């Protein structure tokens, strides 16, 4: 039997990323760059798209690892920009079916730094469609817009 695999990860309107798509590897994928480049942010986006339960998500620093802190802020809100945001995964099933899972993220206006999540799933999408293009509208001269 052929085991399923994760094909790619897509980020839209995150802190520092407007619309970027990482193509995963069959065995190992590495992220490199100086401090503050955005590696841990990519990790966080992936896990958020995997388990959207907002009660659980808590992104501590790598230092202070293992300390149950109850911090005032879970650390997700700041990784998002104003407006609408997305995080999606493309997966090839053992049945060789292409399925796209993901979540729509959005900041909540108000003093409390809260976040809204709405999961969704797409099946049967043609192999020629890329999520980056599916989630954006081409407005103006190569100045695309994101769509709700």
């Amino acid at each position: 039997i052929e085991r399923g695999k994760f094909r790619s990860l897509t980020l839209v309107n995150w802190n520092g990323f407007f619309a970027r798509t990482f193509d995963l590897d069959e065995l190992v994928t590495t992220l490199s760059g100086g401090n503050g480049a955005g590696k841990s942010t990519t990790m966080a986006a992936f896990v958020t798209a995997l388990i959207p339960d907002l009660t659980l998500l808590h992104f501590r620093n790598t230092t202070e690892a293992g300390a149950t802190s109850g911090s005032r802020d879970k650390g997700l809100h700041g990784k998002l920009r104003a407006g609408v945001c997305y995080s999606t995964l493309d997966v090839i099933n053992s049945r060789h079916q292409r399925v796209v899972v993901g979540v729509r993220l959005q900041q909540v206006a108000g003093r409390d730094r809260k976040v809204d999540i709405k999961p969704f799933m797409i099946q049967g999408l043609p192999t020629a469609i890329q999520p980056t293009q599916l989630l954006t509208e081409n407005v103006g001269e190569r100045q695309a817009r994101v769509l709700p």
Binding site: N13, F18, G83, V84, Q106, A109, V139, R145
Partner: protein, 49 residues
């Protein structure tokens, strides 16, 4: 034949000496009423990589 008389007469004549029991009635935790959720909409745009 002990409680029949003992309890029936109490119910029959309660209003001549109405009495009430005491119970613990701890306060409820007051919370903010949730206002209608207002998200941030900004129609963001940018150059595509």
């Amino acid at each position: 034949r002990i409680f029949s008389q003992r309890l029936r007469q109490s119910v029959q004549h309660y209003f001549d000496n109405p009495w009430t029991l005491t119970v613990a009635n701890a306060e409820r935790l007051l919370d903010m009423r949730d206002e209608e959720l207002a998200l941030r909409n900004e129609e963001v745009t940018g150059e595509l990589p």
